[PDB]
DNA sequence: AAGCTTCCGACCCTTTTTTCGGACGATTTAAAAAACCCTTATAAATCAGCAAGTTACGAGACCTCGAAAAAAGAGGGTTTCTGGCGGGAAAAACTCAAAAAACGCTTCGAAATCAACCGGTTATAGGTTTTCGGAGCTA
């Protein structure tokens, strides 16, 4: 399972999103990450982002 | 000798850093302009309290615009409370059947009886007091 993530967030939300994703993948651009990851991990990732969405 | 691969020089273009120049501001110094002083007897201002007439400054009010704060509206999400539907087990009606059990025939003669009133029997409605079961609690 191989993932590519992009963020269109802005203002206060962008900082929070960076706070989460940076702990799961190396950053490849200003707003994008790319990494391999297991299915369970990805589920945890989405759950975490949802928990504090704006 | 030829082809492939790799450096190297020449150049082209744009961005990033440095240097220089120019301009503007600030400060200092010098020059120019406004001003101060010294001579005045005579003319005008000083001021006394109050009247009579007027207003420059203060207060009130409203408007105007702009911005700030608050409230509302929107959207993202999670947790839970309820309702509907589906599924398995138990109950009870429904269907099928037998075997008793009652009823009738049908009893002339043997109990059953009601009545009022006494004493006596005792099931139990109702209330009173109490073990058993469960509360979970805690590692």
Curated annotation (Swiss-Prot):
Q: What highest taxon heads this organism's lineage?
A: Bacteria
Result of knocking out the encoding gene: Infection with phage DSM3 inhibits biofilm formation; disrupting this gene restores biofilm formation upon infection with DMS3 infection. Normal biofilm formation in the absence of phage infection. Decreased production of crRNA in the presence or absence of phage. Disruption of the entire Y.pestis-subtype CRISPR region disrupts crRNA production but does not alter phage resistance (possibly OLNs PA14_33350 to PA14_33310, plus the flanking CRISPR loci), indicating this CRISPR is not involved in phage resistance.
Report the function annotation for this chain: CRISPR (clustered regularly interspaced short palindromic repeat), is an adaptive immune system that provides protection against mobile genetic elements (viruses, transposable elements and conjugative plasmids). CRISPR clusters contain sequences complementary to antecedent mobile elements and target invading nucleic acids. CRISPR clusters are transcribed and processed into CRISPR RNA (crRNA). Cas3 plus Cascade participate in CRISPR interference, the third stage of CRISPR immunity (Potential). In this bacteria Y.pestis-subtype CRISPRs do not confer resistance to phage DSM3 or MP22, but instead are required for DMS3-dependent inhibition of biofilm formation and possibly motility.
The subunit structure is:
Interacts with Cas1.
Family according to the record: In the N-terminal section; belongs to the CRISPR-associated nuclease Cas3-HD family. In the central section; belongs to the CRISPR-associated helicase Cas3 family.
Q: What is the protein name stated in its UniProt record? A: CRISPR-associated nuclease/helicase Cas3 subtype I-F/YPEST
Query: What is the originating organism of this protein?
Result: Pseudomonas aeruginosa (strain UCBPP-PA14)
**Gene that this polypeptide is encoded by:** cas3
**Full-sequence portion shown in this chain:** 1 to 54 of 1076
């Amino acid at each position: 399972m191989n993932i590519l993530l992009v963020s269109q967030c802005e203002k206060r939300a962008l900082s929070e999103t960076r706070r989460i994703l940076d702990q799961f993948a190396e950053r490849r651009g200003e707003r994008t990450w790319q990494t391999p990851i297991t299915q369970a991990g990805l589920d945890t990732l989405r759950r975490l982002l949802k928990k504090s969405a704006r």
